[PDB]
Structures are given as structure tokens and as C-alpha cells.
Amino acid sequence: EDLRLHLLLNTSVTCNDGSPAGYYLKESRGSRRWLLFLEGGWYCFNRENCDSRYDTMRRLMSSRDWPRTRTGTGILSSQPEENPYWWNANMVFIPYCSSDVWSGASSKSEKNEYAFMGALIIQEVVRELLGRGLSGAKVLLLAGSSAGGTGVLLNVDRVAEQLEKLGYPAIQVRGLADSGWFLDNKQYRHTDCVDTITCAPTEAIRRGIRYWNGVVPERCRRQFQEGEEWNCFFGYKVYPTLRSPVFVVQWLFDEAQLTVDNVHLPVQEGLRLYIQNLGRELRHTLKDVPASFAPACLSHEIIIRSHWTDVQVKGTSLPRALHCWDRSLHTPLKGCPVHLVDSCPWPHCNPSCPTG
């Protein structure tokens, strides 16, 4: 229970139900590294599915029941045994209570049953942390898992711009996007968007942006233009538009990707080819991503799991790869790689994959 809750002092920046958003913080004095982690947990995109999420996933829509502390795990752990990478950093966990993939900029009002303020929550957390020691930082790593990983891609350059505009151009802003790199690929079985479960992420996100007043990074917005901003939620399309260094962690056979592809796991030829092609497409999208870790496993998220150190690609663990990334940001480094993508073509062809 080492990270302590702070509700935002600006109480106009709210969770979905208008309760104040917030963050959990464990300071490390004398460290100039700050890790801000964005929680995940899917999204909702219309009144009916947001109402259902409010009934049974209320902690993802409200701060009213949040505990006063949370325990840091994985990359948020302060113990070097669990976190070889950044155990001495200042740790921040930002709960996901906006259901908008961290993209929204709309308040609850006479027009809006819910507030979708994800993009403003991140900005407000950064602003309030500056007065709690972030002003002295050398590196701010914005990390996140699942929808929080996509949220890194959507917001890392805006955090960089915010700090520059606030007069902190020496803080190096970097991103770590875990399990947020999705493909707008053909589904294995096909359903028109006629309700929540049948609606593919491209259609659900196009609807969500309008419902949330969702915002995307400026260079990506300028490429795709009005009505096409949903493209910016897909990592392989938004990443090339970003300026901040971003390390991409993505299982090749991500369970959430398979879910949105209508795959539910003896596998016959059509599905075998489908799965193999998914891994091949994911690997292709990462070919020119220099800092990446993409194991051939059927799983979902990694960085805040306590056993995150166990998986390796080509003999290198993720904490090692992240350390090599830090060194690279001081020509490639002898024995300390940063681009680690499996080439074997089937889930758990890597023996270090999580056991489940």
C-alpha cells in the first residue's frame, strides 16, 4: 500500500460521474525519474453501454469508492527484486475513470450524462505533480496498459508540449505503451455494428470520439482529418506521427485483439491461418519500431504484473530491454538490445510465455 491517493485539486476535472479524478503517488526523494502509469480497462461509447459499465465496473467511472492507497506492482514496484528497471523512481498510478481511452475532453452537463475527461485528467495530474517535485525531473515516462497503452500513444506528445509551454523544456518525456497496439484487421467472424458486442473497434471508436469529444495528437489529426480521427487510436498509424521516444510492448497474440477479432479459443486450418497471419501482421507493424518488445504469446498486459521480469525475447527480459532503451537515450549497444520481436509463428512458441 505504498502509493497514496490524491484527488485532483481542480475538481472540474472529473471521472465519468462527475466525482473528482486523481492519482496515487509514491515519491522517491532525490530521484529525478517519474513514472506516470495509465490504467486500462476497455471503454464505453454510448449511453446504454456506459450505463451498464456504471453498474458493474464503477471504479472505472467514479472515484467515490477508491481506496486511499494502492500497492505498486511490476514496473510500479519500489523493490529492485520485483522491478530491476526503475525501482527508485517516483511512482504515479493514474486510475482510468473516464472510459474514453484517455482521449476525452468533455464535461458532464445538461447535454452530457457522463464526463469524458481522460486527456484533461492527464494534463491536470502533470500540472499538480509539478508542485510536488516533478519540476525537478529529468525524465517523465508516461506508461500504460491496454486502453492506457493506447492512451500513452494519444497523449505523450501533448505532455511534452504542456511541459514545454509551462517552461520545463529540460524534462525528457517518453512513452511506454503496453498492450495498446491494436490492428484494424479483418475479424475471423464478421458482425455489423448493431449493438455493443457486434461493434468492431473501428466503429466503436468512431462513435466514441463523437460521444467523448475525443482528441488525438495534432500531426495524426492533420493527416487523417475530420471524421477520420479514429485512425489515430491504432498504434501503427499514430506512432509514426509522434516525436517523443516510445517503447512499444505488445504480445503478438494479444487476448484483447483476438476478442475484437471474434476469436474464442483443436484448431482447424482456417483459424490456424488466421492466428498465424495476425502474428505476422503484428510483427510487420513493428519492423521499423526501434524500441519494442513483442513476444509470441497469447496473453494481455505485462508491465504492472509482479512476474513481469520472467518473459524474455531472444534471451532478453523486458526490464533489461527498458534499461537498454534508457542507455540508448543517453549506434546500438553490445548485448543490450532494444528491438525484440519474436519470429516464431504460434502462441507459446516462446517457452518463457506466461503460464496463465
Which one, 107 or 172, has the nearer CB to ligand NAG?
107
C-alpha cell at 121: 485528467
| Rg, the chain, Cα only | 19
Which one, 10 or 352, has the nearer CB to ligand NAG?
10
Q: In this chain, which of 2, 6, 7, 10 binds ligand NAG, going by CB under 6 A?
A: 10
Q: Confirm whether 146 is a catalytic residue.
A: yes
Quote the least distance from Cβ 211 to ligand NAG, whole Å: 18
Interface with ligand NAG in residues 123-162 (CB under 6 A): 124
Of the ranges 8-16, 40-48, 236-244, 324-332, which one interacts with ligand NAG (CB under 6 A)? 8-16
Of the ranges 9-17, 138-146, 231-239, 266-274, which one interacts with ligand NAG (CB under 6 A)? 9-17
Question: Would you count residue 12 as binding ligand NAG (CB under 6 A)?
Answer: yes
Strands (E) in 17-82, as ranges, are 22-26, 33-38, 69-70
Q: How many residues bind ligand NAG (CB under 6 A)?
A: 5
Instruction: Report DSSP state, residue 7.
Output: E
Active-site residue among 100, 157, 178, 254? 254
Q: In this chain, which of 92, 120, 125, 246 binds ligand NAG, going by CB under 6 A?
A: 120
Q: In this chain, which of 3, 13, 204, 324 binds ligand NAG, going by CB under 6 A?
A: 13
Instruction: Report DSSP state, residue 22.
Output: E
Q: Give the integer Cα–Cα distance in Å for 202 and 233.
A: 9
Residues 6 or more apart in contact with residue 55 via CB below 8 angstroms = none
Q: How buried is 49 (Cβ within 10 angstroms: 0-12 exposed, 13-18 middle, 19+ buried)?
A: buried
Active-site residue among 31, 63, 77, 146? 146
Quote the least distance from Cβ 12 to ligand NAG, whole Å: 5
Strands (E) in the chain, as ranges, are 3-7, 22-26, 33-38, 69-70, 90-94, 139-145, 172-178, 246-249, 253-254, 292-294, 298-299, 312-313, 316-317, 339-341
Closest CA to 178 of 346, 319, 288: 319
**Residue ranges binding ligand NAG (CB under 6 A):** 10, 12-13, 120, 124
Instruction: Kindly list the catalytic residues.
Output: 146, 254, 300
